[model samples]
Target: RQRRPWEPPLDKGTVPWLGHAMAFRKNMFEFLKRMRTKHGDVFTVQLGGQYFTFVMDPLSFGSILKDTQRKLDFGQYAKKLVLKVFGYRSVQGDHEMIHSASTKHLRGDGLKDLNETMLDSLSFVMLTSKGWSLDASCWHEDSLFRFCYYILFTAGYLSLFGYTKDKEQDLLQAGELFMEFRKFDLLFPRFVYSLLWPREWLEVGRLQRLFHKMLSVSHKEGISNWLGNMLQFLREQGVPSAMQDKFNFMMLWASQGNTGPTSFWALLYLLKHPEAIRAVREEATQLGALQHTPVLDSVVEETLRLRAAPTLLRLVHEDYTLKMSSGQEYLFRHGDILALFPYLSVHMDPDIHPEPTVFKYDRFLNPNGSRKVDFFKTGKKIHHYTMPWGSGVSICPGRFFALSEVKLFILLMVTHFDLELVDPDTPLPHVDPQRWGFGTMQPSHDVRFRYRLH
Candidate 1:
């Protein structure tokens, strides 16, 4: 019953390679799940001009994650994809190194001082008995994505460039224009727009001019909090800041473009599953120690579990063999890529939770009221599947801030008003495949709600 080394998987369709290529861009999650059911969890598929053997089995996921660790280069894909998408960019990592360097300054004074400050700020939001405030009440469904753009845009701006009162003034002034920016971001394929449109080119010029001018004004007004000044690095090294705006633009596109839809999709489900919503609120109240108020940091961890955002990717650093959870082995060549489907594949595994299909807002909470995922021993445990910001040394540094903002936003929304689907009759629209790709699987249509803040 043993197969030859060169044999292709019999489960593969006879459809042309280009056919699979086209289908890959469609909802890949559905395809992979079906393939796993029919062909077993270990199978190969061609996608985007390459053959990738998907390892959906739990043990394989752990092995590859640990094995690839540092050797898995973020810079590689960032470079090619960044170059192809943003064009004319040199070095996509300047801000990362800049942020790390800035961390030294963060450590200089008292660690407790900063922690206490964060705790106080978080508590302020929790202790308040106010409701959610929507900047505008009646925007379309993508509005959720828009707010995420602003949260990240604002926070990333705050942490890296510092803050400014004048920048706040400009944000107030540019509210509509900023919404335009989020919509404009979703409209094009990366490489194509980066190539074909002067409007796109000029949009970069306009955004750069606004951000830099705002940065300067914020610097004077005392609020320019951008995480890293890779731009400043350029100036220090005798290179002009203009040299790197291209790379920054790509960051704008990647971070903004991905986060918005994801934020929306999480809420999309919550709107339908009010039970989950109420449970989350109940848990939030408990984390605030079951008082009438809720705390920010408490929900940060919980929402992260509720919405494990990054939909998995693979890093192939070795030609090693992996023993599967199925009591089998998967072998690969020296230069091969090991494919991954994000947490939902395994997070949905019944062994990890009771009734894996229902939305349990507090499901990530253990009996002892702690993170189940954080208790992993094998690094191959069931909990390893709950990767919201990803893990290990390369975990998303921007994650904590994202969590802070999202948790605050959700806490505000649920506490302030009741949210129900636009239609009480029909089931919530199916998750949209077109809207799905930017980050998470998005709602099939623009969802709407009515809210009267408490």
Candidate 2:
């Protein structure tokens, strides 16, 4: 007999919860790959004493987050884990604030301002990371990814709050300080140090002292430049010192953390597919050698569609019914996870993408060129499947910013360096599944590459 909706299936490996944790602790990518093949996509599995419903179907997969309303918030599933690891109060707190501020600012005359700020930010990231790579030895994909994160974080940190530039003295040296900060923010939050009363106050103060001292408070060229002009605005507007670190650091984490992988796989996928690489290069050549004209936008869009963001995840509440592409309806109970792997599935969906297994650079770019495939409304071609930034009210508002950043970065990379995957024979990175720490699937292995200066 086939498994019924209410009936739980047998988990394959030892320690479905604890052993799985141990397995993930050992090697996550292999564990996910092994169990996934055994359990299939929609099976119930226990992990660390929690039951999760994993889904691979796109019908309910990509849209779980948008469809869940506020009933199933990420906070419920993710908050306690963050607290244990990083002493975090909330993940979306600052994200929500920025979204609200943007929504408010985007009204009437401010939308253009918001977009302009984003463009400037993107330009700055490109210049800092890839623009500086001229005539250098081949860029290692992993190290280059880390470099992109550093630049993105640097730009993001300054944009959210004003900082002290002259007081900090050196730019690159000062940025290295953020490496320590990023380490903390990587697995656990810095606020974790403030959990206990006296210690919390002390560590919190330590964090502030560093922030106030290192930031180049003046010199915000745009939203892009390192807090290029914060002190002036702070003095004129009388903004409080209390919220500076919170606001600034929030921007740092939101923008920088995700783009590293986004850029990594984007370039990786293109490099893997030689045809795609040729097409991208051809696109660049057509765009006036990119110095005189602008056409990196289309190239980045295609790359994002191919490989970015691991999966779309949403929690369920109030017994929602999900209809399959076929006509079957599945009931998602409260506390169930409705998930779709966009990184794995969207790029692989045969229906949404014809010959989906292979990479086609212009797949989404229609022959007529009527509309950018990235800009989805309703009834567009495979509109539901393209989720580089995700969808709904809570979509990465900074994604527009990130997309521009990647375009400029890729343009710089292609213009300056010859590229190839670390292991040409290895088509995809092994996925580590034991932990879901970074909100996306961590690349399975350390992908290495070498650059010989052209």
Candidate 3:
């Protein structure tokens, strides 16, 4: 192992051939933390027959992110994960084309229409009550997690994935199918399941078939949303119908994976902090004074800071040397996979954030009472602080729209309903460990709340 100049030192754990999977899989965050402390920021570990080098420092992470597409390419790795986890089987070119088209639609002026559609859908869903009837107290009692899920899931699914009032049943079926997809997401990290179901080597075939039919219909009769635009993109490229369906499912899954849970955590944070509620409510009332209110933006920022669990994976397309800020250098090799755990490595560092674990609504705010831009640590201004949507060329393309969706929903909820926690003394939900590598982990438990007309 020492003779190979292209490989970093391995942090292999006890039990040969097991390859650190036990410790790594048991608790990924703590495991990575221990590994970094012991083996330094750059080291390799084997997880289920695959090698991954984990990098923790922000400057080194930035360097890793800036590599040429031919080296440290993230696109192919993303395509592989989508196929392994969500069972989306599409060629690399299809995903690349779809991602570009989706980016154009979500980030440009196309966002105005998306924001309007999502806000309209949110208002409609909120008014309908989502099957929760008003009780003797004239308020609907429901879990805030569930409340956010159904509303945002429906709003995001329909508005972004393409739906029409005329196809209400199809829309409803899509919602039901989404619930099943969530079950699959929960089971995604099992590794066994990924090898079993998607490969058709085993018998549990329910997920892929349902997702297939749903995407098939959407691709056949396209609507006017991101998913629809992506289908249009595929059609223009002359891809096959089956490939389009798979890519369509990938699009649908990507649209909601972060938005729904992030929306929940954002609202939960606001509701838990009385000062934030009052400030944000006032901001909502004075929405026109600024294009986007700073406090509400910080609320979303802090919420994601506390809860987002993003794990960025990149495939090393060529051999290169990684130079860390600590003045340590490590050798990397072609075809090697590297994992960047930005959430814990940078997001939870006390040096970067004074009290990293505590939820401070004003953490991102400036003393001048605007959004703070400078976050200094180690005598240098840090560039990547809270990467809920990631950073660099690979940052999530739909981030603008996602932020708009969360802000709009929170503004509407605060403005339209009288929301109060059933137990004000209730604790914030702990992020589920199983969802460590995924985007915004859902609350481990739910908070009961009551809301009625304000």
Candidate 4:
């Protein structure tokens, strides 16, 4: 049963050099799970122009995450991905330069102000913004994605970059641009769009430039916030004036990408699962508002566990060997692309989470009323089990802010608005299989809902 030095087990497939590419593109989560089942947890399948050895063992995720540059070089793939999709260079280097500054600003003393800005911005747009106020008796039709994007993006934009009364017009334009921006982002992972319409493919960066200039100008005016702090950090590090737009675009992507989709799924599920809605609503009533609501925190965590597609890629630069949970050693070639599909592959496994697909609002709650952290399968412990915002070297700096923004928006929606589904008997929308590894997916079709203040 011993194998040669360069021989790695190949996944069974019908394609040459593109083995499992089509199936993976169709649904990465399921594809990975099936591959693990058929070929064992560690095996290689040729995907697109390269070979990706998927590691599904939960413990291996932590090992790969520990020394990113040593075992896995993330910036290599990240840079290429951003350049191809966004028509710019990678912000990975910028992320490195501003990492500590982001930590200083996002997690330290700046959190209070950041939290306040998020709450204030959501309040203004959702409850105070004109043309959006619904009536108590009448049903109002709203696109779930559109509505969620408007509130979440606007609040996140204003909070991270600072805002003013005169900027309402700019915010409105950016809100519209967000739709186009989202379309571009959604198609970014699918290279077919690039091949079919190269011109239209590159046009995705138009809004990136738009928001880029917005942040640069905001910095000129001495606006002080999360983004402003990032700008200062970049300037201090000499990251080049021309690349300012690209770095700003990176922050903008960070701010908007996961939040909008997350809010939609969170609110939509709340509508579908009335018990969660009632529990969150009752908790909100006890706590008054969604700003730092504990039950809402549990709700968001559980929602992410149920729906997040948290897959991250790392490229192997030098030949190396990896150790698995079972203490088996596997050789990784110099050019092999390694992937860790922790969220869906492991998070949804029945051994770790009983009734994995069901939305358990309190799944993360501890017996002592703190966040629970005990999960095991087959007598082995799992570390950092749920990773919507990745972990370790790649942990998202904007995670707390993203969750806070969603929490505030959901709290506002439930507290101020009386929500009802357009079709009381309509089935819940299925997760868009196309966006398997890209954050949470929006509902398959737009669902209408009416909301008004109490």
Candidate 5:
């Protein structure tokens, strides 16, 4: 067999056409590790009739990330996924509209308003509920994951989508939505791969239809400007009403799905390490007025480093040679997908972050208590060390708001509540393998905990 000089190593697997799809779906982190070990930093593999060239070298990410769209196009691939998963058809200028709307609403003064709204919503969700009492004597026991996800999801949903006149009804409706969303999320990976069974397919269909109805344009009143502007753009583009509804569900998923689980992980980590919790609590109390939280910020960053796993993908539009940091290059063909898994390459790389598996709350802090931005691999400083929010054009636009949401949740939890694991010695649960490429990872099982007012 003859191979082209410019082509990267190809391992199509033993299964015809199906290729490494099953193994990849089962546990992508482990499977990618195996592939990287067998073939150096760059390699091509077939998965579900498509060829994917995965660039494992963190130093080489900039070549693909910063490349012109004429060679590597992200929109085509993203449009297909959104249509398939979110049932929203992408129109011209949709990406630009998203970026524009996000910039206008999710940052600076706009973010200040949203944060105020979120804080009010969060207080209503976390405090006004009948279940919680002001008396510190009573303890409320629940699954930590459920509590975190439910509260964050409901409050965030309220903040972005707006509230109805009946506050109680709003809370109940948002709570119900989270329940259905969890069901949809559990089947999401299989849906993406077109691997759902007949039973699951019917369930997914039912859920999709329900979501479309629930998030229809009729529900747009009182929504955040971020969403209102986007909806207005779609209306201006003459996108059908039904498709706009589907887009609402898609935006809802994009905004709420990751932040909740991220909050859960951040809280769980703080609970596990008493010293970390102490430091965060001290910072929250002492610096409450100043609004600076270097310790808490580091904890959030560390949590993201260990848990966030987003697969950055691009559609190759032309035959291009990718240059590596090690003075090597590989050929990528048109119609192929270029993928980057920074979770493995950068976040967990031993050279970049020592003891990458263990959770160190202040890993992102310097001796002088400033944020640390310098990380090196092979004596060369790394720019894209931790990619929880992704890089380049495809970066998550809601990243700032998302961070604020998590930080607020942590601050409230540490300052206002007494939190601890039901089983003090319980180890961290394994992450849900099916959710590798999605945003923040979820625990395979819930951990029991009790919280009471402080």
Candidate 6:
């Protein structure tokens, strides 16, 4: 086949229209790595009927990010994904409204109130509940993954969605909702790839309706301003109530999905590294302010660096030239997809993060006890070093609130409880390969752990 001189090398897989869809769905990281090695930092591959140009050079990210929205539209891509995954069809200005609400409620002063509410909710779930006891000699054994995901998911859910007059009932309901959410989450990857079995497809449909009912406006009282504001905007826009309910489920997924799993990884790392735990504990003791623990911050950063794997994508609306920092250029065709898997390009790049796979608690900390920002590739300063929350137009709006959620959970674990793995010799579980593009990878299996009041 003849190709344009300016076009990047294209590799249409051996299969006809299916292309690399099977391999890409099976293990995205490995597939992309193999492609990058074979075709350099820039290459185009067919997945299903779509042609995706995977840009594996971090330095070239700016070129993509700074491009005009008319040329590379994120909303065009996001709308389809959200509609398929969450059953919510987005309307015009919906994305802007979300960012506006998030900016007002999930950041700075807005976040302060939510953080306080989150703390109260977390305390209620962790301490006021009957499952927890003050008996130091009696250790409570549970799957560490379940414990972290459950507590964070429940508390975060209650905090953002609001609590009822009956706190106990609210907690119980949230716990039940979380169980269903986990089932849906497990099927999420294949669901996105349209590879679900018939039973799995039916289950996903049931879960979607279940969540839509559970998150309906009538079911919630005392909803957070963050959520309330968005709902209000949708109502004013004349979006139907049923659509509003689907929107509610989408918000719930967006707000609560990743933080819990992230906390699991952060705490698991701290458990394995005793010295890191000691440092965090000491820092927590000296700090009364929730956000001042740089040690814990570094731990969360490192945990995300190792575990967060998001595949950023933009839809090409018109023919475009993508110029790389290395002075090479590739022509991106209209109707194709531009993809960036920064977990490999930036996070695991040895030049940008030395021994990238290792989880060093202080990797993100500077010598003088400040957050480190400088990273490099090939002796040149790199800007997009570790995008766990992503970057550009599609960057996560709840990042500030999400970070607070993770940090607060870790703080409570370190200062309020004595935590340990049930079997010290058990190694860290590998990430579930099916969830590579999703934010905050879950372990293949849960690890057993025990904890008691500190």
**Candidate 1 local lDDT, 259-344, one digit each (tens):** 44445556655676667676667655542222232323333343344444354454445555666665665565544445665544
Candidate 4 minimal-lDDT segment of 10 residues: 215-224
Clashes of each: 22, 23, 0, 0, 0, 0
The 10-residue segment with the lowest total lDDT in model 6: 128-137
Q: Model 3 over residues 1-454: C-alpha lDDT tens digits? A: 3326545678656775567876776678888888888878788887765678888777666677777445677777766766666566664366566557667678666777667777777777776654444453478788888678777777777676666556557456656866876765556556442333545433235666677777584432425466666666667777778767776666666777778788888888888888888988887876223256898888888888888878888888887677678776677776678889988878888888889987787788888778897876786777788788876556787888888878888888898788888997978878787668778887778889988776
Local distance difference test, candidate 1: 0.49
TM-score of 3: 0.90
lDDT string for model 4 (218-328, tens) is: 342324366666666667766676676776776677778789889988998889888989988987876224444667888898888877876777788887677777777
After superposition of all CA atoms, the RMSD between model 6 and the true structure is 1.7
Task: Compare the candidates by lDDT and give the number of the best one.
Answer: 5
Q: In model 3, how large is the Cα lDDT of residue 344?
A: 81
lDDT of all predictions, in order shown? 0.49, 0.51, 0.73, 0.72, 0.88, 0.87
- Where does model 4 exceed 4 Å of error? 1-7, 90-93, 130-136, 165-167, 191-199, 205-224, 236-240, 287-292
For candidate 1, the per-residue lDDT at 385 reads 47
- lDDT (Cα, tens digit) per residue for candidate 5, span 168-230: 899999999999999998888888878889999999999989999998876524779999899
Candidate 6 — what's its lDDT?
0.87
Which residue pairs collide in model 5, if any?
A: none
Residue 354 lDDT (model 4):
86
Window of ten residues with lowest summed lDDT in model 3: 195-204
Show the lowest summed lDDT stretch of 10 residues, model 2. 287-296
RMSD vs true structure, all candidates: 6.3, 7.3, 3.0, 3.3, 1.8, 1.7
Using all chains and alpha carbons, the TM-scores for the candidates as numbered come to 0.72, 0.65, 0.90, 0.89, 0.96, 0.96
